[PDB]
Amino acid sequence: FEARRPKAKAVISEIDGVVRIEETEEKLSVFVESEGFSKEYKLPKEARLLVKDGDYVEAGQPLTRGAIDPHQLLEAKGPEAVERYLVEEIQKVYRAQGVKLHDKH
Amino acid sequence: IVVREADCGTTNYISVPLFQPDEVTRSLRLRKRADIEAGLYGRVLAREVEVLGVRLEEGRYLSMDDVHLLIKAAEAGEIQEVPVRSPLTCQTRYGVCQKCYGYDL
Ligand SMILES: [Zn+2]
């Protein structure tokens, strides 16, 4: 509700394309290759990937498990995507406690 | 925020999903009934829907029988999302309109 940036935030793709893993002992890096662009994401060693090689990711789609930064998602996808994310994530907490609450509120 | 008029005349809407992208199985699975009811019950249809030989007209409030009929159609693979009016797309200043809010729970 305060739109704060999570400490252990996930990493999302700013552009859409095909992923390219380069796992090595030195570091782990994730490459998003497109028709004319190629972006590099340097994940830490303790990164729980949810995307494998040969997958088609879109802008705003997460590449690692964790909580998405609302401000980063707003710039990548748009106002409609961040509103959908906020309503769904808030309802997850209230469902776990068995509380029924309409989406309108 | 106060309900200040009957209709704002807008044409924007939101689409309420009926399926969820399960990650462990990498597939689309039907959402729970309580989650579907929490986002559809007592809401005004933005567009006309035709499922299971029944015509639901635009501008119709969704009763709990209508929500259950929609879930039945989803199980038969006839509909994936429902277009409804929401406060997120209302154009009333300083509040919402009657059609964008829905029913008094
Ligand atoms: Zn309205």
DSSP label at A54?
T
25-54 in B: which are within 8 Å (CB) of A?
Answer: 34-35, 38-39, 41
Hey, what are B95's tokens? 């509040």
- Tell me how far apart the alpha carbons of residues A20 and A55 are, in angstroms, rounded to a whole number: 9
How far does residue B60's CA lie from ligand 1's centre (Å)?
15
Q: Tell me if B85 sits within 8 A of B44, measured CB to CB.
A: yes
Domain that holds residue B73: 13-85
Q: What are phi and psi of A9, to 5 degrees?
A: -80, 150
CATH number reported for the structural domain that contains residue B63 in this entry: 3.90.105.10
CA quadruple B65, B70, B71, B77: dihedral sign: positive
Give yes or no for B2 touching A (CB within 8 A): no
CA B50/CA B63 separation, integer angstroms: 16
Surface-to-core class of residue A17, CB atoms within 10 Å of its CB (0-12 exposed, 13-18 middle, 19+ buried): buried
- DSSP assignment of B1-37: -EEEES-------EEEESEEEETTTTEEEEPPHHHHH
Closest partner CB to A104 (pick from B23, B35, B101): B101
A90 touches chain B (CB under 8 A): no
Resolution, expressed in angstroms to one decimal:
2.5
B52 annotated as ligand-binding: no
Inter-chain residue contact B38 with A101, CB threshold 8 Å: yes
Put simply, whether B58 touches A (Cβ < 8 Å) is no
Class of domain A10-66: mainly beta
Q: Which two tokens stand for residue A11?
A: 């990493």
Note whether B86 contacts A: Cβ–Cβ < 8 A. Answer: yes
Residue type for position A27: K
Task: Quote the ligand 1 centre to B2 CA distance (angstroms).
Answer: 12
Phi, psi of A84 (to 5 degrees): -65, -40
18-37 in A: which are within 8 Å (CB) of B? none
- Residue identified by tokens 């340097």 is A42
3-state secondary structure of B71: helix
Residue A23 Cα to ligand 1 midpoint, Å, equals: 51
What letter would DSSP give residue A80? H
Going by their DSSP bridges, the two strands B2-5 and B95-97 should be labelled as: parallel
Ramachandran region of residue A38, left (φ > 0), alpha (ψ -120 to 50) or beta?
A: beta
Alpha carbons A82 and A17: distance in angstroms, whole number? 21
Instruction: Determine the residue among B3, B43, B85, B88 to mutate to test chain A binding: the one whose Cβ has the most chain A Cβ atoms within 10 Å.
Output: B88
